[PDB]
Design a protein around this nucleic acid. Structure first.
Ligand SMILES: [Mn+2]
Ligand SMILES: [Mn+2]
Ligand SMILES: [Mn+2]
Ligand SMILES: [Mn+2]
Lengths: 203, 217, 217, 216
DNA sequence: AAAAAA
DNA sequence: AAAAA
DNA sequence: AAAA
């Protein structure tokens, strides 16, 4: 392991502990998340302006770095002109979770609703020039309908939170994709290369 | 009374030269901005309100702190509030014009000043400010001298940034700065005399330009 | 939930070689001690009461944490309270005896055990515990394998500590361990059989000896 | 500057009001000196002197080793520092230096012009005695609050609290005398200020000599 | 339920 | 040019 | 301040 970084909530001072380990030749406990990446993928995330890379660059705390990979990481970062692609992936998966998700692995569904909401909020705020990633600040700076409730779903309890997701979607004037069955969603996620929407759908 | 402390600059990046400074930012309430400098250390003091305001303004220096600063300690979370307040702008034309106008002043009146070290520091300030701003406008967050010269390859960028901690009084500095200004298609502001420059820096609120002149007297 | 996190071991020292692990200590309320391992990481959990007890008891591991550990975060000040409780002892004869007794067990009955990796790890533990304790007794705070071999230069110390990263059942380990034990003038405990060793470890409160017996199943 | 370390209260997470941020900068070719401001204190040392403080088991080096936070270290000097550290078996020399200076301050310093320096060095005497005796017992205590808890002699907290004070109260002398009595300190066999000076010279009490110099 | 890392 | 802790 |  050539470099180690603290990120997430523990890096902001406020509760999961998230650690990024960079290693060439490559997860979770009740309390910890240890994520591994090789240097090529770390730098690619910077070059492609991944929202996750923006978080690491502006909020990650370097524990050690023997090779200087985190400084090459930062000098490769290009914040993209727009994150419409990412916003659309979050919107589309949200509609799928609304239409066919409220009765699946309920743990994953709630985690994924929160992912949709956070992704849309992070992307719109990054577009406007912000570097906000914590749930608390996202809800303050992107005060759409039920944002606090939905981000808090990242929670294995199932109620009638279908109404909350629908309200959120209306307040950002989201349009459902032109799909009917769940099988239409599969081909839509495949066609739009919605990796998370695909990984989610089978789970 | 100092509620937070941050390492920034080359030492925060791990890329220190023989004659490189160690840059430290101390956040302490109830003071105006000032810096304590020794042989190899620069200690900058700022109060929290000024720090958060600089973030809200999208100051290029605030971006550097957010992107590269290493928090040594923070007892109040002020650096988290600082990052929440940051707004990276799309248009740094104001800061670019400030660096342009001061560069022209240094070209016209700086090359034979008594305080050679200040002129060189501020030539490099003009070039770095313009380079940093143009790259931020393109979605890049670049601050090291090496990457600035690579990513903003205008005429004499590397050797002019190299003047930042120099007492060189070479008469070639004029040609190099005029070459840089031509390569970015700079226009001299509608000014002639040194007093006219003062009013211009007053009128256009060029804080660093004003202080550079006061320093040179 | 984790109230504090600390880097320790080789990475905290800045001397991690090819086959190094990253060692992390998470201080977690309301858990008993346990660890989470990958090929390149070790994550140790302790609750605050147990962390402070190890300091009060002068555990050699606690000395390592206080002397070389790097605090990543500490929301409760538990590491400050830990260091205030530390009492470095003058006499580590108990621990030295625990290391000697377990080394004889492993020499006599460990060399063809199924769990070759655990045997090798615990041979290195015996040698390291003896070496660290003797050096602490002399006023030195030494934990790195390189410095332990230098400051406690007994037979095969470097080779045997290097077994902590080995799954190999080489025949050379028995001779080397015997050479080390001879070089410190060690003697077998009065234990007439392998089966009598669990009773001996029980009566002498050799926790690592008992745990090693448990894991060798 | 090849290495930089935070120490003192800020390294323990306790930097508050009226407390100073303490930084240690390692750089070549520099006699020990310190730059000080309202809220910071920047001590410079060369590598040879830093490692000597470890080899000699200086009480201050023990603080750096067990409580210092490394900000950066490009040469590994702090690792060679820690591997040189030898905690002495006895700190009687340091205890006597603090006792002797405390008596000098009691006898001749309680009315000096430089009240601030007297108060600072009273606290140094008390802190040095407390730290030294706790280190001899196997502890690594340096914060004022923990020193008063773990070395609970008479007035320890009041006297360490003089370290940032310009108080000239008459109570200081009686509190210092009480502290010295509670550790059964014996005053040096001197009868004059001139003889204190000769005593500090003979016993090589560098802080007692620097204090005397600074008071005049 | 679970260290024994250094 | 320490004496901080 | 104007450090980056
Ligand atoms: Mn979070
Ligand atoms: Mn720089
Ligand atoms: Mn090791
Ligand atoms: Mn203190």
């Amino acid at each position: 392991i050539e470099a180690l970084m603290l990120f997430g909530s523990a890096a902001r001072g406020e509760s999961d502990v998230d650690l990024l380990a960079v290693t060439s030749g490559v997860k979770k406990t009740e309390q910890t998340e240890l994520q591994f990446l090789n240097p090529e993928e770390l730098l690619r995330s910077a070059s492609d302006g991944d929202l996750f890379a923006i978080h690491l660059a502006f909020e990650g705390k370097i524990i050690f770095d023997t090779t200087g990979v985190f400084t090459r990481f930062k000098e490769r970062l290009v914040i993209r002109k727009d994150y419409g692609r990412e916003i659309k992936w979050g919107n589309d998966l949200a509609w799928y979770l609304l239409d066919f998700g409220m009765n699946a692995n309920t743990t994953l569904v709630n985690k994924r609703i929160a992912w949709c909401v956070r992704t849309i909020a992070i992307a719109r705020l990054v577009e406007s020039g912000k570097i906000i990633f914590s749930p608390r600040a996202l809800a303050k700076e992107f005060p759409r309908k039920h944002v606090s409730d939905l981000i808090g779903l990242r929670d294995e309890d199932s109620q009638t939170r279908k109404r909350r997701l629908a309200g959120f979607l209306d307040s950002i004037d989201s349009s459902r994709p032109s799909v009917s069955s769940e099988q239409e969603y599969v081909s839509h996620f495949e066609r739009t290369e919605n990796r998370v929407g695909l990984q989610t759908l089978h789970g």
